[PDB]
């Protein structure tokens, strides 16, 4: 029975990773406003961070915001297995990563620039504007954008 009051412990919009996280939506889903974090990740980040899930974003301490922010830096340290991660075994680095925030279009643009610089097919596709995977263009993808 979470019929709970508080007086100032709640606060709408708390900024995380230079993003804008709504305080009225449940934690797990509140955090997903950020690029790079889906519902799978945010369900797991908040588990290791000793955070009560029944809460809304607006609640939770700024040390509980600190636990979650930090775990997202390195999930690989808080017992979060690599197959949960969105940049594993980098092409130019060889380690595991989970890119976040502004850094999503970052390494993504890079990758595309990688098979643009090397001038390969899947990149040439990207460049041209057309599709990258072997699907048909005869009949589909029309109306553009």
């Amino acid at each position: 029975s979470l019929v709970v009051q508080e007086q100032g412990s709640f606060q709408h919009i708390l900024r995380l990773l230079n993003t804008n996280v709504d305080g009225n939506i449940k934690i797990v889903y509140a955090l997903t406003t950020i690029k790079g974090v889906g519902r799978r990740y945010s369900n797991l980040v908040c588990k290791k961070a000793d955070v009560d899930l029944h809460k809304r974003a607006g609640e939770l301490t700024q040390e509980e915001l600190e636990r979650i922010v930090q775990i997202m830096q390195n999930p690989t340290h808080y017992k979060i297995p690599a197959w949960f991660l969105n940049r594993q075994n980098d092409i130019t680095d060889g380690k595991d990563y989970h890119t976040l925030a502004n850094n999503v279009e970052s390494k993504l643009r890079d990758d595309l620039e990688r098979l643009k610089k090397i001038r390969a097919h899947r990149g040439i596709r990207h460049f041209w504007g057309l599709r990258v995977r072997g699907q048909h263009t005869k009949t589909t993808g029309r109306r553009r954008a």
Binding site: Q7, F10, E59
Partner: protein, 69 residues
Amino acid sequence: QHAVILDQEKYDRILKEVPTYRYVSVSVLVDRLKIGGSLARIALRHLEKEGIIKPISKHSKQAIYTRAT
């Protein structure tokens, strides 16, 4: 919009208004107040602690509570 944290002020409403209507449901609370539906559902759990409202039909889809006694 609505309301999903007990405004305390809008907690006072909940036990001084629910014995008014004799059909209190999941959305009854939602629309005569401005709850988030999630806290309408835990309003029910609450309002049936030492129940202000009396139940007749409990279900995962639907909730049916009458007035007092």
